[PDB]
């Protein structure tokens, strides 16, 4: 299978490499551009908070790392244009560092003599792919796509489902999610968001996503339809997103846990749970969603119905499992 | 009037009590505590405080009683509230904050232990359940045992009481992100027949029962089964969150809603608005019982069908009192 | 080959009492847990056991019945009795308890799992002047005769290593001892009553908190040449699980930090209890740690003035799972002796 | 001179903001320099996650601020040499970016118009005051000054009293500490520190810090005898100090805790307890340094005895104060 070089070694990019060498890919990973060194990057791949000690040898030289006893190359180009990647013959990116989060950003890997990008975040109106809900959609023209966030992964699954079984009006969701990087340990600027500027593991911190907004990139039926946000909170990884929609149709709480049930079944991007389960039993998953039939609420008075779900999701390893479905299949056509 | 005191549970909410009455100069006197544990303990508890720093005035103790800001307040160590001696020291009313007497048959022990009142710091079933400058005026002279419900309900009435005036509230669920408390646990273990009240509450984010919209037409009869809810607690301390998702009898913009919410919460001692990026830490201390956050309003709609969602915060502890303080004070004068 | 005792029933089922039923899981024990005594349902117990906060979902498969649990297709009684000398302990033939409650701390309390039929106990926690052992370094003075033994807490387990090698090489003539530890159960989640100790009563999420421990003034249950050579104490700290110990101590030798730590390295080479690093790590790299203790190189520091010297020597600790890891090696051997 | 600016409007320049405010200086903050806009850092300054509200009025422009009706210029100059010092006549800067720690750098504001610098943490070998210790060394022709540490404003205090009454000879520190922004809030780079690179309020981290080590600059005849390192934890603020050290004089717990009674007596800087505080009760604390006698330990074997002491320091507010004190001072001469 191709060869790949991963732009951003951080929180995603090392769990990239965790996951393909878990799943022993035929992808082959012979390229790492980050802003650092080698021996930096040993050490975040060998010690990891969330997921404990890496699971194969890490080695360092001067210019690469030496994982499990193979040679990845290790550039730190700031700029994409000049990443070496025909040195090693990376073919696709994994495109990790959230700086270049556009068609027209990540054509400099295009540029740097790279075949295709895969975009770890939402990239604007291009190709965005959950693995189980539309990933029917890449074909072997693609050059450029994007997997979207995290929530995405989690809410379009639990949706796609809703809306076969049901139809979805309307829509909004909150995702209750850890912290992430791009929020602040102490109180002090973090670029122009002022809550995102506020020491995110003593806080609940309101914050904007785009999962609902851009839905139909994924869903296009629901094109308009959802809104959300977030609120982020003190937990180091794992999340809960919850979806209050009105249906078209009336329904009880064992009719909508079953429709969920049976989307679930035979579904590697998509779990089920009716365990009271928190949030620190999604730490590792390797599903980008998981329904929780034990939170399905249904309001009701008179013809008016209102429909709450909710899901799960390691919005780290969880979201990276389908990254990695995604990859597969993009490096295979 | 009424203006002695006695806690039953000197807790979280039980030393909040104290401090807030003396914090607003109250003519009501906690004249005496029944809890568990000695003085010296509770002493140490009332001076040091790890959600609101070090106690404001004067704490000391003896065998039978805490000294604060020089005042004398008995201590007794009663498992059973029928057992209490409130006659001693004279204690009209009894603010009732230990979790087990959430009743009116339960709390009726306090009267037969000679109090003439209680007001319980929690739901309590069907009796009156006030939200203070929501349905205060539904208090008479001769109620003797009411609630004001949770920290919960005190977020939730103020925003749904000014939205149902306004535009009518046909049908809502609301989702609280809140501060995890002492019903949950430190490490991972039985916590009763709960099973998610067993979880480490400062690892996780754990979903998590509440009555707050199940029981508000006890707050707002119009609503009496119109809303549903849950929570999710999560790591912080204290500070917390409501939101609330709706179907209204009007359509409206974000700006109609958060001018309505600005006129509903004008001069309003209990109920704040703000337009400002606050987070969490943000609330801690709020001399409010819900302050509405215009910032996070949002109107999802498609065609004639319309969501919407409001949010306020609320200090789950300090908040909550600020309200429980204010029924009191009015309790004790009808 | 005479048959070892292979039946071990565990009173509390824990932190402790859920991960000595996984470690034994883990590393293919000829041990088998029979009955599980607790205060709660096979429900409650199952749930717990198959989601932990700290490691994650369980490794085997887990159901119940009204009074059991089935764990990797194995069923396991479970009792709910709250005075140890009426659990029935011999309907599975219960012969060795893993007394993980923290409510039978001595062997007065603890004979009780004997009257109720068992053969031996083992106590996870400091249980007075009894046979105490940490393993790989006493656990040659355990014999066929002890019935009622203690492998004392994390904090020895992660200290004594230290101090015995330490002591072996240069000598330890005085010493005092810090522990910056993870929270516990004996602690509180939010600013409350918890018994008669004032500090145990502060949101332990939320400070620093000192703590008192044993460790160090009952060091002389395990290595004796050091009795009453040591105090120490605890501060608390808010993570979940992991902990270290410092060691400041006067040794009979002037020593640089190199040779200080290649005395240690010569300790944990060929011992399955005590490990070594020389990396920068931090404590979540030591959840989930095989070791009773990791002493780290990068900590060791010397100073030296004129004829006075002190040590700080560091080592790691998962105070749950590597604690754990101890307790079932010495309830390996306590079974075949 | 009355006349300060701060360089660095953080977690520490915004703080002595406060506290200059709170005590009613008659030193005028007329300039902040920083990187970021005044409307950002007028909603950090209103909003405080460890302190709470500012209990001041908080308004801005696009290049002021206006706080309690002042107006306070706001500059972004990300040189200090390039600062516009004397437009509004900053004489005094409190250097506040930890950019800045040496003469050599913080020369830079004098070139810039300035006509003293006081650096809040440690600078090298220059005069360095922890206040009610050796202020009396701070000199009229001083113009660059440090103030060490949190931590050397904690431990000092104590080495300074426990030496006067008893001699050290030597001894060695730990401090754990509250996690500050020098620390990482995810897994990732840090500059070159590899335990700086791991998240902060999910470890305990070692940390090296020279308080110990440069004592001397503060207490000379210790200098030499004293070493040691932090672990930082998951607290937002509110730090302790454990001295173990070999005095000259044979001790009881009560004699040590009777001469550190005296040392606070009267002692704005350095305060006594006996109670049985946690950290968080330090929290906005008015000392440098809080000394418990709770912790006190008296280790004996033979004639060797090994001294254990123990000191609460709010490493933000409290080190805070000790700033102000020496600042105020370090104006009139
Ligand atoms: N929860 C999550 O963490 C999560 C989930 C889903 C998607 N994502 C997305 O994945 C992307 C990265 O997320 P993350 O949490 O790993 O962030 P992170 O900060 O942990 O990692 C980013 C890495 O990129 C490096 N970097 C920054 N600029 C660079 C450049 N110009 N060239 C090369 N390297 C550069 C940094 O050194 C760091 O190592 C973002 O697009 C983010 O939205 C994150
Ligand atoms: N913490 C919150 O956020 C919050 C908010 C709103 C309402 N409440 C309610 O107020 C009440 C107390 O809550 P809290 O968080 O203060 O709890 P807490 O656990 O902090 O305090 C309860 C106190 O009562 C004591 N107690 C228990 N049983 C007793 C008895 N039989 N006699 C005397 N004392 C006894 C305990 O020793 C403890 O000091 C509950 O009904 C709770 O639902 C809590
Ligand atoms: N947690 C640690 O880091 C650690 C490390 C080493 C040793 N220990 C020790 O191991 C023991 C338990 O520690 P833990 O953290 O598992 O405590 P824990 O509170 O997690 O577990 C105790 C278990 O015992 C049960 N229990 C309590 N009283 C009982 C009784 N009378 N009969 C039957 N069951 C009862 C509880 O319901 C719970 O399931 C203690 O002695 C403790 O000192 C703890
Ligand atoms: N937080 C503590 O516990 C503590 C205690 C003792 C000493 N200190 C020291 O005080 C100093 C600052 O600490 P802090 O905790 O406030 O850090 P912080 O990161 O909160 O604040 C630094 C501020 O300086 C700004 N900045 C960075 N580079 C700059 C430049 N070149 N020009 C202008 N502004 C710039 C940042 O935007 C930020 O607002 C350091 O030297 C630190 O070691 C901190
Ligand atoms: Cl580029
Ligand atoms: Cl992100
Ligand atoms: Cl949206
Ligand atoms: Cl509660
Ligand atoms: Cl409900
Ligand atoms: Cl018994
Ligand atoms: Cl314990
Ligand atoms: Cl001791
Ligand atoms: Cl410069
Ligand atoms: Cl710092
Ligand atoms: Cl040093």
Redesign the interface.
Not at 4 to 20: A, D, S
Not at 95 to 118: I, N, P, W
Not at 267 to 278: K, L, P, Q, R
């Given at each position: 299978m191709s060869k790949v070089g991963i732009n951003g070694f951080?929180?995603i990019g090392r769990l990239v490499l965790r996951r393909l060498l878990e799943v022993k890919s035929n992808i082959d990973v012979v390229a790492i551009n980050?802003?650092?060194?080698p021996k930096?990057?040993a050490?975040?791949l060998?010690?990891?908070?969330?997921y404990?000690?890496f699971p194969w040898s890490v080695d360092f030289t001067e210019d690469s790392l030496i994982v499990d006893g193979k040679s990845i190359a290790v550039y730190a180009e700031k700029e994409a244009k000049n990443i070496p990647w025909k040195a090693k013959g990376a073919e696709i990116i994994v495109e990790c560092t959230g700086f270049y989060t556009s068609a027209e950003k990540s054509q400099a890997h295009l540029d740097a003599g790279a075949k295709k990008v895969l975009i770890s975040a939402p990239a604007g109106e291009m190709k965005t792919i959950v693995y189980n809900v539309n990933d029917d959609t890449l074909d072997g023209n693609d050059t450029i796509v994007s997997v979207a966030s995290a929530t995405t992964n989690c809410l379009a699954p639990m949706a796609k489902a809703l809306h076969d079984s049901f139809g979805i009006?309307?829509?909004?969701m909150?995702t209750?999610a850890a912290?992430?990087?791009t929020?602040?340990?102490?109180?002090?600027?973090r670029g122009?968001d002022?809550?995102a500027?506020?020491?995110?593991?003593?806080?609940?911190?309101?914050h904007t996503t785009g999962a609902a907004k851009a839905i139909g990139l994924v869903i296009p039926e629901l094109s308009?339809?959802?809104?959300g946000?977030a609120?982020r909170?003190?937990?180091?990884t794992?999340?809960?997103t919850?979806l209050?929609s009105?249906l078209g149709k009336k329904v009880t709480a064992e009719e909508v846990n079953n429709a969920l049930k049976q989307a679930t079944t035979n579904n590697e991007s998509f779990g089920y749970t009716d365990?009271?389960?928190?949030?620190?039993?999604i730490?590792?998953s390797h599903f980008g969603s998981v329904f929780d039939a034990?939170?399905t609420?249904i309001?009701?008075?008179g013809d008016?119905?209102?429909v709450?779900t909710?899901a799960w999701y390691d919005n780290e390893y969880g979201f990276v499992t389908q990254l990695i479905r995604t990859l597969e299949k993009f490096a295979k056509l």
């Amino acid at each position: 299978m191709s060869k790949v070089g991963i732009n951003g070694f951080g929180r995603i990019g090392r769990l990239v490499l965790r996951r393909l060498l878990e799943v022993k890919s035929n992808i082959d990973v012979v390229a790492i551009n980050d802003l650092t060194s080698p021996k930096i990057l040993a050490y975040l791949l060998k010690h990891d908070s969330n997921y404990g000690p890496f699971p194969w040898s890490v080695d360092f030289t001067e210019d690469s790392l030496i994982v499990d006893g193979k040679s990845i190359a290790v550039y730190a180009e700031k700029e994409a244009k000049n990443i070496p990647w025909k040195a090693k013959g990376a073919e696709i990116i994994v495109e990790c560092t959230g700086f270049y989060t556009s068609a027209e950003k990540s054509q400099a890997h295009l540029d740097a003599g790279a075949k295709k990008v895969l975009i770890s975040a939402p990239a604007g109106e291009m190709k965005t792919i959950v693995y189980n809900v539309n990933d029917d959609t890449l074909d072997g023209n693609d050059t450029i796509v994007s997997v979207a966030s995290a929530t995405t992964n989690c809410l379009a699954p639990m949706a796609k489902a809703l809306h076969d079984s049901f139809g979805i009006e309307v829509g909004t969701m909150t995702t209750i999610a850890a912290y992430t990087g791009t929020q602040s340990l102490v109180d002090g600027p973090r670029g122009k968001d002022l809550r995102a500027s506020r020491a995110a593991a003593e806080n609940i911190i309101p914050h904007t996503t785009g999962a609902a907004k851009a839905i139909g990139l994924v869903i296009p039926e629901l094109s308009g339809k959802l809104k959300g946000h977030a609120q982020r909170v003190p937990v180091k990884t794992g999340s809960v997103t919850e979806l209050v929609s009105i249906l078209g149709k009336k329904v009880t709480a064992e009719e909508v846990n079953n429709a969920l049930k049976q989307a679930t079944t035979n579904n590697e991007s998509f779990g089920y749970t009716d365990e009271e389960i928190v949030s620190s039993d999604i730490i590792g998953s390797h599903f980008g969603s998981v329904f929780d039939a034990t939170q399905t609420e249904i309001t009701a008075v008179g013809d008016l119905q209102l429909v709450k779900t909710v899901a799960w999701y390691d919005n780290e390893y969880g979201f990276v499992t389908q990254l990695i479905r995604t990859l597969e299949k993009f490096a295979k056509l």
